[PDB]
Design a protein around this nucleic acid. Structure first.
Lengths: 103, 107, 19, 198, 79, 94, 103, 79, 108, 94, 19, 198
DNA sequence: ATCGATGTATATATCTGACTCGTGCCTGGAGACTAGGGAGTAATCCCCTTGGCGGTTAAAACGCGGGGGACAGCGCGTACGTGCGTTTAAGCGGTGCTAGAGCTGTCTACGACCAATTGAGCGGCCTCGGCACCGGGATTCTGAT
DNA sequence: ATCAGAATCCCGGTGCCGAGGCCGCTCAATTGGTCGTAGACAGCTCTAGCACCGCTTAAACGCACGTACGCGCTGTCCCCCGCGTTTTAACCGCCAAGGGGATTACTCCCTAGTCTCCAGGCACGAGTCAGATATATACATCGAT
């Protein structure tokens, strides 16, 4: 007779644990690899050195944009009288921003 | 020769006035800057920075004598007429406001 | 303590429905 | 392998003095000199590089002449490295067995050769993994003479390949023992003459 | 081998559980990598343009703020 | 051995006039430095095109006054312009 | 007996008649009155004259804002799989614009 | 006689019809008037600030295009 | 003296160069404006104006008129991603909207 | 009344270059009069920002190139380079 | 007549899903 | 109600030449000379405007002193507006009886008087519908020597009030009819006695 | 699949009225020639970034079970659409007329600019104590009684 | 409603590195004066914006009809959450080394600057034909049947 929680109620403790802290949520190594990949996609093969503060800047602004995207899409999905999230709702919250997400 | 004194203490402001007067013409914003616009601009920056720091109301709840950027974010996202000024500007090591919707919480 | 500005440090004061 | 090549030629021409450009280009000899006759050299080094880059683009070099530009730029300027010397103990077949025995654990690797009359062979090694494309900026160089037990090594920042490099160098040669002498210097010809004399 | 799946199956869950999300579908873990990569393309495509303009070969942290400003989101704390 | 100046000293001085018992880390100094070198740039880059509209070649105090009444949202501007004006009257005393 | 269409089948001819039309859709007198009303609020009593091309300018910008607002809210309502629009849909598309509408 | 209800009901009907809206609810006729009002309050303040700076007493079409450009939408075609 | 040869004709450019150089000096974008910058900038504006007007003409002939009203400009700016992404924050005076019915509004 | 210079003639000339048989209304001339000043102001603002980052005190023809590859989205911007290069060489050879 | 500049006149090319 | 009245004061003093302001405030006399001692005349006129604005904001001004400022501005500058003369056809309570027929159907309207000693009443009238506040910028004026059967009127751009104003002047006076003389100009003092002395 | 009823794209006049092309004329391009001064370009140098390596370990991978939400189908009722008779005010031309935008003169305070102080702000430096981690109990929720 | 059973927190404790001063020092404010000059102020003109005035008619208002979509109710079923375990690379030091910012001296080109033109672009004017109605209709479409 173990203890199993209600499904769902771990998420509220997770939300209230993560909205407090100022840590980052993407590890520096895989984000570093996925950002060093793109310079070989844009600069015609030559590798550019990344100064190790600017990686933290991309690591900061990527989360500070993506969490806005996910929160606003969740607001849209809550508007749709359903409590979960979907690719349709990330699609919708990406569309109702015009070119402001893309420049 | 006389006993000199700064422009800032002659204007009673903390933000420097020689610095803003150096930047306001050698940053190519006009070929002429008047003798008063640096004083005014130092005043506006002074009022804005005091409006942010009065942060210290948020620091009482955390009981930390330092100010760390979580306090600054919880000040600026939670004060409207400074929120809209910095509405599309984020902050390093930011964090968001503690924010749950209404439909999510059970009975 | 020299500044203590007179304002109302109120809320996010949501738009999009009212006020 | 399409437009990284012309950018490699551009960034390697860019690392030359502005005054020795016609010399290294007439020593290079991929582009014709009539094509050289339409290039201004009072421009910026960026612009000179960009114009000769478009010239190399329209003449469509793939891989060889760029590595010749690399090894010739080192042939004029070898003191822009740090050179180690390995003492060992007990050319067509040499380079053939070398190519066949350096494609042993790592496959997509670029190898090139420059023969000199003083038994000197300069081997340029552009390194890479079986997954990664071969990088052109982490090169290594081997300077070897077939009458000495001494070899010169441009120890790149792609280390932990230099054991494999020296083992395939020894087995590619007619030798058995490999050893690193303790001396290294950023002037190649100093170690060259003090080990040819002594 | 694969380079896009570093943003791993609970890390996107960690981001959603920061942004007030109670339950996620099993398709967001693949779909949001597209948005993350599009945003990273539209930042680095200006960052390398800036630091290519100054004839340098590093990417200084000023030339990430100076690209994020051109995108529309200034990033403080890196002056 | 070359100097890149800051606003750290002035932020630290104005911290004394609002909260005399508090501290700020280095990253909070970074936030309150990049904030100032953003908002001063925004006000000047507004006032420049504003005085360039009316073909005046100067930037007086008045164009900064229009910049802060236009740029700052709402009632905050209503005090900031006051905080300018009293300030510049102090510059007409001495 | 009279002849009535099915409802909606008037509206589609209305759409295909209106998207081709480049006229203004707000009449000049009421919009001129409602734009002169706000200058009394904002200028502390004294009225300001309006160069009658600037009335056409605001008469253009009100449409350039409002038809995009309504189109995007209708798109977000189409995300909820319901054919009509609602104030929730306008509030949601009013929400996911950040501060760019007001900043 | 109320000066905000000049934007009448079939005008808003046809204005949604331009955007491609089939059916509009009975309560949009207040919310769209509200957002039209707040948009004009966020534009005309800037326009009269422009002209009050220039010591003029009418608002030129330039002095509302400049308020729009600072607000976030340029409008071409007005000199 | 010398020949009266405009600086535009030393590029074959239909946009003036002396105007751009005067605007870059007097408009206060720098202290000194180098001589290559207006030569470059007149070409960039020539290219952009031609890029609009060509698609404007293709919209014009597909309504069987000859003069271009702003409706063709709206229908030829917002019909290509290589220009729509440039002008997302610009409304056009009396432009209209693209012919745009959504997915599931149509009967059956 | 005195002098209000514009881009009215030049767009007419480039239209007669592209099209022999298309007229152009006065409102279209207004649109192509505001578009040219808008694009020119954006590119020159980016040129000034790039002058102000790298500490150089000028806007050379090199510094326009970064702005033109910056603003215009991708497959358009490259063509502008192969205009302007094809422009500027034709200046310097003459 | 020398215009019709060499570009790729293409679609709307909708965003928000990739492409 | 509060910003509007100081606003009207500020606008009306703003249209005054720089060397006469201390004159007309001396004729105004609402704020004392002690308040007047902070006018920094050696700056531009809008600074003078803001200074007298905050001065009259201090002493809690109201519309009587603002209208008095307006009518002294007329008494010292009558050559701005355009004056037309009317002629009637067959005094201490004239002030009280003229404010009866004005508020007959046009209710929310403001009227004021000031007296010259030649039986010349200067009358200020700022028109307004009974739906909104009357607007103090479209203000019309009537000067009338009660001895003469002639009257001078500068009515502003609010038309369809000239017949009501002249019929109110007819019924308030002891006359029966009014006529618009065909002469009019904006130089009042030259035509001030032009009906006399023929 | 008809056929009646209904918008509408098509088409010959016509009557514009916005092009647009003409035309002097200037005021802004353009040669011509300095100059100084900012940027190119070698040349060195130290710093900090990449490259490994070992080794922990705290997250990932996966799996598996179960249940709680998405979706689907179905009634039902209303709030919408839609024409219709009306009525009212928007827009039509037309007339003042006038406030007020613009345009010239002409000063005159005033800001650029050049030099000599000279100290205020900046780069190292160094304590030290505010804060980053345990830790152990002392709490607050919560899932099935 | 209770009660074990987890998360959490909080009172206390320890170690440590980043703030707060400290201190030399040096280059950029500052005083002081000169001098063009940008714009402040005053005055004049003409033009477009406002207030009517009638009118006339197209749209707005209300209303009656009616239906179909939004919503609530089952239901069901299956996809995702929550542990458990088990693998595995992220991270932390740690060494190194050398590529390359970052500075410095020096040196040309080149662009601001001033004349001296002088003519491309511009503000007026006239003749328009490219549209804007306007019949009308020939044909597509809606919807009963």
């Amino acid at each position: 007779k173990p203890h199993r929680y209600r499904p769902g109620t771990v998420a509220l403790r997770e939300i209230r644990r993560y909205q407090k802290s100022t840590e980052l949520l993407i590890r520096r190594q895989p984000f570093a690899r996925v950002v060093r990949e793109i310079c070989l996609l844009f600069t015609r093969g030559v590798d550019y050195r990344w100064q190790a503060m600017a990686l933290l800047a991309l690591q900061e602004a990527a989360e500070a944009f993506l969490v806005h995207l996910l929160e606003d899409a969740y607001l849209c999905s809550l508007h749709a009288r359903r409590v979960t999230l979907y690719p349709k709702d990330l699609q919708l919250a990406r569309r109702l921003r015009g070119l402001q997400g893309e420049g | 020769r006389a006993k000199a004194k700064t422009r800032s203490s002659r204007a009673g402001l903390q933000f420097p006035v020689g610095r803003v007067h150096r930047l306001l013409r050698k940053g190519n914003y006009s070929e002429r800057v008047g003798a008063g616009a640096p004083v005014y601009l130092a005043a506006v920056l002074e009022y804005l920075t005091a409006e942010i720091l009065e942060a210290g109301n948020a620091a009482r709840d955390n009981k930390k004598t330092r100010i760390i950027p979580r306090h600054l974010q919880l000040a600026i996202r939670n004060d409207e007429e400074l929120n809209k000024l910095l509405g599309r500007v984020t902050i390093a090591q930011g964090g968001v406001l503690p924010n749950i919707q209404a439909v999510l919480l059970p009975k | 303590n020299v500044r203590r500005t007179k304002r109302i440090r109120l809320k996010p004061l949501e738009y999009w429905r009212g006020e | 392998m399409d437009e990284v090549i012309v950018e490699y030629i551009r960034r390697t021409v860019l690392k030359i003095p502005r005054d020795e450009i016609m010399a290294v280009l007439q020593k290079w000899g991929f582009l014709s000199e009539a094509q050289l006759q339409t290039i201004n050299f009072r421009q910026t080094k960026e612009g000179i590089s960009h114009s000769v880059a478009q010239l190399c683009e329209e003449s469509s070099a793939d891989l060889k002449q760029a590595a010749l530009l690399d090894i010739i730029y080192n042939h004029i300027y070898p003191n822009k490295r740090v050179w180690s010397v390995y003492h060992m103990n007990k050319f067509r077949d040499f380079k053939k067995k070398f190519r066949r025995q350096i494609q042993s654990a790592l496959i997509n690797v670029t190898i090139n050769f420059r023969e000199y009359e003083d038994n000197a062979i300069w081997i340029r090694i552009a390194w890479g993994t079986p997954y990664t494309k071969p990088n052109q900026y982490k090169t290594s160089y081997v300077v070897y003479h077939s009458q000495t037990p001494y070899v010169f090594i441009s120890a790149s920042v792609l280390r932990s390949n230099l054991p494999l490099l020296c083992q395939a160098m020894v087995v590619a040669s007619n030798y058995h023992d490999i050893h690193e002498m303790e001396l290294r210097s950023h002037c190649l010809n100093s170690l060259k003459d003090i080990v040819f004399k002594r | 081998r694969d380079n896009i799946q570093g943003i791993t199956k609970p890390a996107i869950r960690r981001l959603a559980r920061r942004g007030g999300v109670k339950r996620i579908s099993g398709l967001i873990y693949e779909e949001t990598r597209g948005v993350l990569k599009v945003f990273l393309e539209n930042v680095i495509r200006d960052a390398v343009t800036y630091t290519e303009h100054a004839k340098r070969k590093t990417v200084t942290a000023m030339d990430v703020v100076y690209a994020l400003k051109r995108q529309g989101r200034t990033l403080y704390g890196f002056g | 051995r070359s100097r890149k100046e800051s606003y750290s000293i002035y932020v630290y001085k104005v911290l004394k006039q609002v909260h005399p018992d508090t501290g700020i880390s280095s990253k909070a100094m970074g936030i309150m430095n990049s904030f100032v070198n953003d908002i001063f740039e925004r006000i000047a880059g507004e006032a420049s095109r504003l005085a360039h509209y009316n073909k005046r070649s100067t930037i007086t105090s008045r164009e900064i006054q229009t910049a802060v009444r236009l740029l700052l949202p709402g009632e905050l501007a209503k005090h900031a312009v006051s905080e300018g004006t009293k300030a510049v009257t102090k510059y007409t005393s001495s």
